[PDB]
Design a protein around this ligand. Structure first.
Ligand SMILES: [Mg+2]
Ligand SMILES: [Zn+2]
Lengths: 79, 101, 37, 50, 98, 187, 211
């Protein structure tokens, strides 16, 4: 995360997909106003996203499922 | 005196790109984490000079700042010096010690 | 004023081997760099 | 080290190697003098024979 | 010498060169090749548009950075439009399709 | 732009040996490549290395133990992918150590790897050294009155092969040469 | 066999057992040959000693032989200076050199008699025709230098970037070409994401909305 991203690369399996997923999560945390799943210790959103990815708590499928659930809750509340 | 604290806060985890001309291979541009120093010269790690083909007798380097989150994550995950340990041409290590070490 | 111009102009067709064959130095560096790098 | 253990141990090992090498190179006091370029005593004989 | 923003050329709308003009550093073809070999597409795109001659992109990027939103909206470089006008001035019809 | 084209073609890799000196061992020529055929043990018909195996250091050590001499591997020249190549015909990413990922600009990498070191380039008898069997390749010979068999072929190759089966010295015996020792003997 | 002698050049005639006997070559009489009438030869014999051109190697032996020759020669040049370069890179350069192919007979394909075209198109057409029980065209590979091989690109923006701009622009205007912006340099010029690395996936999505 800070010095080496090898664990995140192993978790995802491709450096380019890792960059894309981490950028999506970091933008969710930064502008989207979400909350981190790991204890943020004076870290930027990019490093927090990388640490979440290397911990198994964030990947593309998880982001898709969370997005669909949030959309369903939003449309149920808009009723 | 508070803008210096702000500046030390904004560069905490924000890579910069160092480049030396001519760029013959892709190891001529690399990414580093900045440490603020007093003076006017850029300090370079002794183990990366061979990748830059650089020596300390008058050479100059250029520094670039990535702006968006994607660029910062590319700098950290692709162009960081701690990822570019092996040589893309032959696979041998390229951060090997030399001279005084 | 107008003056005659008939000097040959170098192009890309000059093969790589011919570049090393020639003893002379190129008018403009093909490489995107100055005369110090 | 890289082939057996991985990436991060290699980075730590390289940093430690650099620090130790610099420290002990400074401690050695290795210098250069004019008497270090010792010339063989047979040079003039060989040149005379040639 | 360092720069954040400054004055641009009138025709090409790109940063000037030299310390005396408070100019920027040139990012040539070989640096582009290095970025291509790394695979850093977003770094190269941001280097090509919002840092040199995407006139609206520069302003939007500056505003977003001040607002704390690190995201860009790239557009068309101005030098390509200049090239299109110059090729049209030769009597050749070149146009962007669809 | 692809994972695997499924082709079965490939080039044959042997150590680069000129004269009696070995310049490139087999380990340095197949490391990180993908085999196109099953590598059989020289003694028997038993499979040593299966199909489509990325030869890392462990497999190179295994090949060294069993004394294999020629291996067939996949190359990008004989790749069935159109408008690009596949990951298996390329092999290992030399800068990372694993297999190459899809979407990599390998042409620029190759051009830089060939061009960067270009700043450094400048602008009558057979004597064996190791005991072992002697193998003659493409030899046409006739017996001379002197009792020494002479050669009537240009394409004769002399190979020094030990009991294990590795060729260590390969010389070229010209036309009309006089051989002090006959084929099938031990020197 | 030795045919007509001293008739301008030493004519050497190779007679196949059941092939085209009248095939012959006008070998210069100054050249020192190493062949006789009583020697049966196979394609690849060194009739006269000397360095060999890679075109003959490609035509007679095949692609693998010329690839091996080029790789070995380049590595021989590089090893004298103690430089280590993997053989992958030379192989991709060679693959870029072997891009064209010449038709020897049109067959069922709509190709001409002897036009030089792209190899990928020919192989695609042949693999399509063979699946329908028809007959595909046969061809012969061509070998081009890098300077000649890089001048046969299908994009006038990219070509005008690094070739003579006037010639490329005139030819494109007369032909009326259309550029699809498919390569790296084309997307660099218009400030788009290159179809490689972190941008590669993006382009695929675009290609899903295009077709
Ligand atoms: Mg210097
Ligand atoms: Zn393939």
């Amino acid at each position: 995360a800070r010095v080496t991203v090898q664990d995140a690369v192993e978790k995802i399996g491709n450096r380019f997909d890792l960059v894309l997923v981490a950028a999506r999560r970091a933008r969710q945390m930064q502008v989207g106003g979400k909350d981190p799943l790991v204890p943020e210790e004076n870290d930027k959103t990019t490093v927090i996203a990388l640490r979440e990815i290397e911990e198994g708590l964030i990947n593309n499928q998880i982001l898709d499922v969370r997005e669909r659930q949030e959309q369903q809750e939003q449309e149920a509340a808009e009723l | 005196a508070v803008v210096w604290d702000i500046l030390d806060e904004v560069i905490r985890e924000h890579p910069v790109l160092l480049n030396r001309a001519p760029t013959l291979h892709r190891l001529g541009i690399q990414a580093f984490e900045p440490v603020l120093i007093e003076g006017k010269a850029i300090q370079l790690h002794p183990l990366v000079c061979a990748a830059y083909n650089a020596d300390f007798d008058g050479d100059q380097m250029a520094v670039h700042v990535p702006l968006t989150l994607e660029a910062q994550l590319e700098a950290r995950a692709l162009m960081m010096s701690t990822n570019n340990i092996l040589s893309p041409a032959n696979g041998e290590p390229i951060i090997v010690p030399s001279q005084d070490v | 004023e107008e003056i005659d111009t008939r000097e040959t102009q170098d192009s890309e067709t000059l093969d790589t081997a011919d570049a090393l064959e020639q003893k002379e130095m190129p008018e403009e560096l093909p490489l995107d760099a100055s005369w110090d790098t | 080290c890289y082939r057996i253990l991985g990436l991060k141990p290699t980075v730590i090992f390289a940093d430690q190697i650099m620090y130790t090498g610099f420290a002990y190179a400074a401690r050695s006091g290795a210098s250069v003098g004019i008497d270090d370029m010792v010339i063989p005593e047979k040079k003039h004989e060989i040149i005379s024979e040639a | 010498h360092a720069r954040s923003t400054g004055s641009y050329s009138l025709v090409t709308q790109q940063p000037l060169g030299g310390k005396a003009q408070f100019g920027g550093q040139r990012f040539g073809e070989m640096e582009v090749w290095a970025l291509e070999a790394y695979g850093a597409a977003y770094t190269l795109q941001e280097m090509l548009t919002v840092k040199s001659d995407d006139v609206n992109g520069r302003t939007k990027m500056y505003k977003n950075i001040v607002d704390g939103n690190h995201q860009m909206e790239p557009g068309m470089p101005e030098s390509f439009n200049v090239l299109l006008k110059e090729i049209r001035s030769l009597g050749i019809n070149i146009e962007l399709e669809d | 732009t692809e994972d695997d084209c499924g082709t079965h073609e490939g080039i044959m890799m042997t150590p680069v040996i000129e004269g009696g000196d070995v310049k490139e061992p087999l380990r340095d020529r197949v490391l990180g490549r993908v085999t196109a055929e099953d590598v059989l043990k020289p003694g028997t018909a038993d499979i040593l290395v299966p199909r489509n195996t990325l030869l890392h250091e462990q497999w190179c050590d295994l090949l060294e133990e069993n004394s294999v001499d020629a291996v067939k591997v996949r190359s990008v020249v004989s790749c069935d992918t159109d408008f690009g190549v596949c990951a298996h015909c390329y092999g290992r990413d030399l800068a990372r150590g694993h297999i190459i990922n899809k979407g990599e600009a390998i042409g620029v990498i190759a051009a830089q790897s060939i061009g960067e070191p270009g700043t450094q380039l400048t602008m009558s008898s057979i004597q064996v050294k190791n005991k072992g069997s002697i193998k003659l390749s493409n030899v046409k010979s006739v017996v001379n009155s002197s009792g020494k068999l002479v050669i009537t072929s240009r394409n004769t190759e002399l190979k020094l092969i030990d009991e294990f089966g590795r060729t260590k010295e390969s010389y070229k015996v010209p036309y009309g040469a006089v051989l002090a020792k006959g084929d099938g003997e031990q020197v | 066999s030795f045919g007509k002698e001293t008739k301008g050049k030493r004519r050497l005639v190779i007679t196949p057992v059941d092939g085209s006997d009248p095939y012959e070559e006008m070998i210069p009489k100054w050249r020192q040959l190493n062949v006789f009438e009583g020697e049966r030869v196979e394609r690849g014999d060194v009739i006269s000693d000397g360095p060999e051109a890679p075109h003959d190697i490609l035509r007679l032996r095949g692609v693998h032989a010329v690839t091996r020759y080029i790789v070995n020669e380049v590595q021989d040049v590089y090893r004298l200076q103690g430089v280590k370069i993997n053989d992958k890179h030379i192989e991709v350069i060679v693959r870029q050199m072997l891009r064209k192919a010449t038709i020897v007979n049109a067959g069922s394909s709509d190709f001409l008699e002897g036009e030089q075209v792209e190899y990928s198109r020919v192989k695609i057409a042949n693999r399509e025709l063979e699946a329908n029980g028809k007959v595909g065209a046969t061809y012969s590979r061509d070998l081009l230098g890098i300077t000649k091989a890089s001048l046969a690109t299908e994009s006038f923006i990219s070509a005008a970037s690094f070739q003579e701009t006037t010639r490329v622009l005139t030819e494109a205007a007369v032909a009326g070409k259309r550029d699809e912006l498919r390569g790296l340099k084309e997307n660099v010029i218009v400030g788009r994401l290159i179809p490689a690395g972190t941008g590669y996936a993006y382009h695929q999505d675009r290609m899903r909305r295009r077709a």
